[PDB]
From a paper:
The BER pathway is comprised of several factors; the scaffolding protein XRCC1, a damage-specific DNA glycosylase to remove the damaged base, apurinic/apyrimidinic endonuclease (APE1) to cleave the DNA backbone 5′ of the resulting apurinic/apyrimidinic (AP) site, DNA polymerase (pol) β to synthesize the DNA, and DNA ligase III to seal the repaired DNA. Two predominant APE1 DNA cleavage reactions are (1) AP-endonuclease (AP-endo) and (2) exonuclease (exo). APE1 exo activity removes 3′ end groups, including oxidatively damaged DNA bases, chain terminating nucleotide analog drugs, terminal blocking groups, and mismatched bases. Our structures demonstrate APE1 uses the same active site to exonucleically remove 3′ mismatches and DNA damage by a non-base flipping mechanism.
Our structures indicate that the side chains of both W280 and F266 reduce the size of the APE1 active site, and previous steady-state kinetic analyses indicate W280A and F266A APE1 mutants increase the exo catalytic rate. The F266A APE1 mutation had the most dramatic effect on exo activity, with a ~20-fold increase in the observed burst rate and a ~50-fold increase in the steady-state rate at 21 ± 7 s−1 and 2.1 ± 0.7 s−1, respectively. Notably, this burst rate is close to what we observed for the APE1 AP-endo reaction (<2-fold difference) and the steady-state rate exceeds that observed for the AP-endo reaction by ~threefold. To further elucidate the catalytic role of F266 in the exo reaction, we obtained a 2.0 Å substrate complex structure of F266A APE1 bound to DNA containing a C/T mismatch at the 3′ end of a nick and a PS linkage modification 5′ to the C. The structure revealed that mutating F266 to an alanine expands the size of the APE1 active site, allowing the mismatched C to occupy an alternate conformation. When the mismatched C and F266 in the WT-APE1 structure are overlaid with those in the F266A APE1 structure, it is revealed that the mismatched C has rotated by ~120° in the mutant structure into a part of the active site that is normally occupied by the F266 side chain. Our kinetics show that rates for both the chemistry step and the product release step of the exo reaction on a mismatch are reduced in comparison to the AP-endo reaction by only ~40-fold and ~18-fold, respectively. This reduction in rate is recovered by the single F266A mutation, which increases space in the APE1 active site and allows the mismatched base to adopt an alternative conformation. A restrictive active site and larger exo substrate may be responsible for the reduced incision rate for the APE1 exo reaction.
Author numbering: 44 to 318
The structure:
DNA sequence: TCGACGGATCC
DNA sequence: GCTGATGCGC
DNA sequence: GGATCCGTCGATCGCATCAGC
């Protein structure tokens, strides 16, 4: 079992956290709201909330989402021609300077996976990375995605400090899942997916916020299959990340795993920055 | 993720 | 709206 | 030749679609 440590809300130089970002693969936004997700969000009170795998077109967005005046600026992306699949959202207390959808590549911008929100001091990207598939049927596609995404993020980070959050659909290293041996040909732990993640960290470059602070902490996961009672056994994967520009590391206060928040087969993760 | 399967392969 | 089947996925 | 091993290999859970009416 795993117990996330208490929230560190001061920076390495003693500056108080001024910004709290929460990211959560809700795996069915309507179901997550029915499973009381927005109660949990309201007690966490983030300044920005990023959601993945909403599986909900904009028309079907439940009413409860306009009853949250702390996250009143809301942006949504859905697949162009495939309903109930993928989907992401970004809700913010303050309006961003600019919002865009996708990474600027037609091939990869059709499944509602990416929202980019530019603020004063940084750019925030939230992403739902495409799963490599059962039988690895989409691994070849995933490797092309990885190359296009890496390139996109490198470009962005060259202009403003970057924060990338969301479900990146890879457990980087053997410490990031419960059963590394049995999963090296399964989606999320292929050498191709792990190599892509490493290349992302090096080429942009980006740092893995949680591992920067807790480099040797095992059993810390963000996702558990619904089957086989995995979550109660903590047989999980760390698939949800906050990746940061190296320049933001002195602003980094903490990177949390909200293990006990139910409502999905992923738990939320939370980032504190002193900006 | 778990167990049932099968087909090496040591004692 | 309801049933039954298919898609997709830690 | 009875008992362990180790590469596959199906059925689980959950959400949302779709076809039909
Ligand atoms: Ca499928
Ligand atoms: Na390894
Ligand atoms: Na630096």
């Amino acid at each position: 079992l795993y117990e996330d440590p208490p929230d560190q809300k001061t920076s390495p130089s003693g500056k108080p956290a001024t910004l709290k970002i929460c990211s959560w693969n809700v795996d069915g936004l309507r179901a997550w709201i029915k499973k009381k997700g927005l109660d949990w969000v309201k007690e966490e009170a983030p300044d920005i909330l990023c959601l993945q795998e909403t599986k909900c077109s904009e028309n079907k967005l439940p009413a409860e989402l306009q009853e949250l005046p702390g996250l009143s600026h809301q942006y949504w992306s859905a697949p162009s021609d495939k309903e109930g699949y993928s989907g992401v959202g970004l809700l913010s207390r303050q309006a961003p300077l600019k919002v865009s959808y996708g990474i600027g590549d037609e091939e990869h911008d059709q499944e509602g996976r990416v929202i980019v929100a530019e603020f004063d001091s940084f750019v925030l990207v939230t992403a739902y990375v495409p799963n490599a598939g059962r039988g690895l049927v989409r691994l070849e596609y995933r490797q092309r995605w990885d190359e296009a995404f890496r390139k996109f993020l490198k470009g962005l980070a060259s202009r403003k400090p970057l924060v990338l959050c969301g479900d990146l659909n890879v457990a980087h290293e053997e410490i990031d899942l419960r059963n590394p041996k049995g999963n090296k040909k399964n989606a999320g732990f292929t050498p191709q997916e792990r190599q892509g993640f490493g290349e992302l960290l090096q080429a942009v470059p980006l740092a893995d916020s949680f591992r920067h602070l807790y480099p040797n902490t095992p059993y810390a996961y963000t996702a558990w299959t619904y089957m086989m009672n995995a979550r109660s056994k903590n047989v999980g994967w760390r698939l949800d990340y906050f990746l940061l520009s190296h320049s933001l590391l002195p602003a980094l206060c903490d990177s949390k795993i909200r293990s006990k928040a139910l409502g999905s087969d992923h738990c939320p993760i939370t980032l504190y920055l002193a900006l």
